[PDB]
Write a protein that binds this ligand. Structure first.
Ligand SMILES: NC(=O)c1c(F)ccc(OCc2nc(-c3ccc(C(F)(F)F)cc3)c(Br)o2)c1F
Ligand SMILES: Nc1nc2c(ncn2[C@@H]2O[C@H](COP(=O)(O)OP(=O)(O)O)[C@@H](O)[C@H]2O)c(=O)[nH]1
Ligand SMILES: [Ca+2]
Length: 306
């Protein structure tokens, strides 16, 4: 039996991320759009849509009030439960600092976690230009999210200002933030579908991610001379995430390479991840030999327990 994967967008930012993943097309993944705002939800491409808090907001947004988001989700608990039914893994994605995301996303997470699903949060923190109130609501939102999920990935939107030039379109910057969740979902789909030479399965994902807190995640791609060290360095250097690898107690790591993937290379990449941790780790290590690949290597890393 294959693990059932569901991705849930909660509020404006959450649903923007989901709409872009639906645009790409993820085949074995179920998408769920959750919002207070009915106009926005009507335009979603998601095949499962839940309008929350109709009695409370009359089909409008939460107007940046997290109490309205939270009570909206509590009003609609049974419809959330129904949409999540059957999930083995749930990704909850949302922008913190607004009303719907901040308030409803932790309610959604708690529902997913009590249904037995491995519950991963992927959230943003507001830009400093949005101001102190917005940042404060977001901090409370992150804390509520941390209590409700198995593992949380936090992307401060301020980090987008470190990866743009003065002309990079705003939408193109948002796509980079979006890639964290998209490549994460794809990585798990791959892990579940493909039998590895050193095989990792969904029980290995649960061991590393179940009942943790903050997580670092990344992917590194390289080829040529120093490909193993370069790939591993890129996977653990995640400029968009709040959490760094230092102090990690649990690591899931996979290397995908062609027939030339050397044992020496595998140790080099794994030593980069071990060393950067700076701890006595529980590493679960996997490898895939894809005979389609020539000189390209792909290292993927999830690091938890700080
Ligand atoms: N070695 C394998 O059995 C294997 C395979 F055949 C294909 C892909 C694969 O892993 C891809 C991968 N995906 C992840 C991963 C882990 C966590 C997350 C998160 F955090 F849920 F987003 C997302 C992706 C990792 Br670490 O590695 C394998 F381990
Ligand atoms: N990275 C990113 N952040 C967003 C996006 N849309 C909104 N945000 C952020 O998420 C916060 C909450 O906005 P929104 O999710 O639209 O409000 P909600 O609908 O009440 O949850 C905003 O303060 C922005 O910082 C997006 O598309 N990408
Ligand atoms: Ca596998």
């Amino acid at each position: 039996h294959m693990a059932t994967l569901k991705v849930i967008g909660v509020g404006g930012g959450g649903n923007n991320a989901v709409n872009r993943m639906i645009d790409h097309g993820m085949n074995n993944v179920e998408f769920i759009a959750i919002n207070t705002d009915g106009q926005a939800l009507n335009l979603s491409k998601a095949e499962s849509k839940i309008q929350i808090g109709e009695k409370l907001t009359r089909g409008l947004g939460a107007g940046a009030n997290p109490e309205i988001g939270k009570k909206a989700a509590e009003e609609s608990r049974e419809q959330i439960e129904d949409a999540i039914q059957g999930a083995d893994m749930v990704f909850v994605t949302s922008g913190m600092g607004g009303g719907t995301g901040t308030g409803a996303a932790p309610v959604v997470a708690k529902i997913a976690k009590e249904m037995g699903a491995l519950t991963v949060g992927v959230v943003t923190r507001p830009f400093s230009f949005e101001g102190r109130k917005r940042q404060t609501q977001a901090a409370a939102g992150v804390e509520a999210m941390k209590a409700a999920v198995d593992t949380l990935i936090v992307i401060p939107n301020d980090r987008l200002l470190d990866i743009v030039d003065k002309s990079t379109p705003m939408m193109e910057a948002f796509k980079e933030a979006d890639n964290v969740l998209r490549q994460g979902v794809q990585g798990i789909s791959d892990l579940i579908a493909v039998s590895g030479e050193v095989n990792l399965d969904f029980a290995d994902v649960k061991t590393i991610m179940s009942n943790q807190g903050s997580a670092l995640m990344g992917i590194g791609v390289s080829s040529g001379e120093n490909r193993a060290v370069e790939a591993a360095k890129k996977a653990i250097s995640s400029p968009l995430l709040e959490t760094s690898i230092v102090g990690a107690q649990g690591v899931l790591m996979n290397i995908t390479g062609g027939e030339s993937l050397s044992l020496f290379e595998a140790q080099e990449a794994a030593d980069i991840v071990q060393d950067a941790a700076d701890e006595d780790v529980n590493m679960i290590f996997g490898t895939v030999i894809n005979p389609e690949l020539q000189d390209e290597i792909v290292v993927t890393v999830i690091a938890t327990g700080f």
